[PDB]
Design an enzyme around this catalytic site. Sequence first.
Site, PDB file in Angstrom:
ATOM      1  N   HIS A  41     -33.391 -43.699 -59.517  1.00  0.00           N
ATOM      2  CA  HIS A  41     -32.286 -44.733 -60.045  1.00  0.00           C
ATOM      3  C   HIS A  41     -32.540 -46.087 -60.051  1.00  0.00           C
ATOM      4  CE1 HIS A  41     -30.061 -44.351 -56.005  1.00  0.00           C
ATOM      5  NE2 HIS A  41     -30.153 -45.551 -56.329  1.00  0.00           N
ATOM      6  N   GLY A 143     -27.787 -51.398 -50.962  1.00  0.00           N
ATOM      7  CA  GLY A 143     -28.780 -51.855 -50.773  1.00  0.00           C
ATOM      8  C   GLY A 143     -29.979 -50.902 -49.861  1.00  0.00           C
ATOM      9  N   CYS A 145     -30.455 -47.861 -50.274  1.00  0.00           N
ATOM     10  CA  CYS A 145     -31.075 -46.735 -51.026  1.00  0.00           C
ATOM     11  C   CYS A 145     -32.530 -46.766 -50.655  1.00  0.00           C
ATOM     12  CB  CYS A 145     -30.685 -46.722 -52.641  1.00  0.00           C
ATOM     13  SG  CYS A 145     -29.001 -46.467 -52.772  1.00  0.00           S
TER      14      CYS A 145
END
Lengths: 304, 302
Positions: A41, A143, A145
């Site tokens: 993503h 942030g 991820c």
Amino acid sequence: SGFRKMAFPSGKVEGCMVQVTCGTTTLNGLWLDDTVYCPRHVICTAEDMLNPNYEDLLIRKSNHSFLVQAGNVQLRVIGHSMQNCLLRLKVDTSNPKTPKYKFVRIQPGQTFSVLACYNGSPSGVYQCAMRPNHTIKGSFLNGSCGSVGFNIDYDCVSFCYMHHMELPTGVHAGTDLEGKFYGPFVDRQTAQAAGTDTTITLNVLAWLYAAVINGDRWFLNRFTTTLNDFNLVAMKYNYEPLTQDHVDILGPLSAQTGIAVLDMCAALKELLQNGMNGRTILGSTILEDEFTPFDVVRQCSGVT
Amino acid sequence: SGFRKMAFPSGKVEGCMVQVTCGTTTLNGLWLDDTVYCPRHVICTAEDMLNPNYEDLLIRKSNHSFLVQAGNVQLRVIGHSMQNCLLRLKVDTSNPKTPKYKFVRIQPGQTFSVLACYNGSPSGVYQCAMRPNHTIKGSFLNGSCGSVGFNIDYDCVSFCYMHHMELPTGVHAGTDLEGKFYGPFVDRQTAQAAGTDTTITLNVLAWLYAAVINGDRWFLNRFTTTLNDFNLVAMKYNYEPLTQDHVDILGPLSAQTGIAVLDMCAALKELLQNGMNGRTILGSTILEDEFTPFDVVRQCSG
């Protein structure tokens, strides 16, 4: 010594963290040899998450669409692809800090260390457990991820988790390093939510053994219970059903203390039914469930 | 979201850990540039520890009395000196992994990360607080002496603790990196015991704010209190007296959440008097005091 929840030293994983940027979307990637793994993503904007067509979205992308940064150095991407919910970026430099490693898919109840990262920069490390409901109660900000979870064995880093999202209850969901989610979660916006969770009986039991190993044994008794009778009780307290497999997993601790598992279950039964009467176990007022049988051995033996 | 007792990444420190042996005693040492720091009691025998005179024990040693090993490799000791309760060993090679660093002496109530080590090898990292009584509750097995506590700011490692001993209650005592003990403790087998301790009030409040930021406010109330009346209650429950400086430190968290410091104190006062009634805060059933206001701000969203 005392007994604390501990994380594995995070040096070997710190050396593998990089920043991956695609447009205005920046997250963390894991750099092992000449490949950087990150959540697919990273190629999404806002409206995109609402059921994006990753296949289609990826085509519109080219190697230069990806900005990889290690320290203050840009790593040139020379290839890219998708593997389930992960993006695999081939770079032109093999990570000189690559540790010995393996990818493993953890089972519910098991623990691991998480290296929280932001902009490819490690910020903190903590121990947590994969909950029976397949989410983790972590601590992640926007942030984060791409942050990874792992275990270490000797000199080998076993990567088991990569962070992808936060659910409505503020708990976390992610994938193994093959890009396959733990639980039924998906990397897009839906009404998905964590199911009801339970206490990890196996870990609670392992923890009671650690307490006995450390001389905290007031809770022990001279009785025992059948597996089925133990489960009729535990389940009333929202504890996970104990299986014969869990009983066997506790064999080494049972052997070390000479306390049969069902004998310890009788002790646990009493603790759930009557509480602690104001006393503590390993200095705790509650029954801890984030230490696996393996964790207690490891710790109660000074493994480095 | 979420809130964990997290530690700083330990990598920068792992690359500084070594093993130091003298006679039959081995423990950890910290290798920075061309110097290795370790507890001076590495030179002590079993009897020596009962009433050792360190100046007298060290004068009888030479550079070769010390065996420093980085992993499997021996580091040649080319110099040695004593600084308070630490041994400073000069070696003939520099640690390429030495990070940007500084030696800091921490204040009771502050937190730091500890990299537990054995035989110069990392075992685990955990976060903890210096208790008001100067001891730390940290789980240290025989051989962890020399392990260090630290905080990391940007790329700079601020070392603040070196483990020296375990007290009768099972808590631990140590020094700063200049070798000065935290607390009145000394490095020898004696009757010393951990002093009276208190709950770190400033931290509990910081934590309550963390609970609110994470969207949880069941413990709040419509009351407020004066600093004085709050201390009259908190002190009854073994809480450190709260000062105006402490209130001021909580200013930013207060502003972020819209809850007045004195208002949060009223909530805390109610919690101490009423208990939690089966409820929990941030998954905990007890009030936690190992998170400073700085820790909460660093871990919680803005």
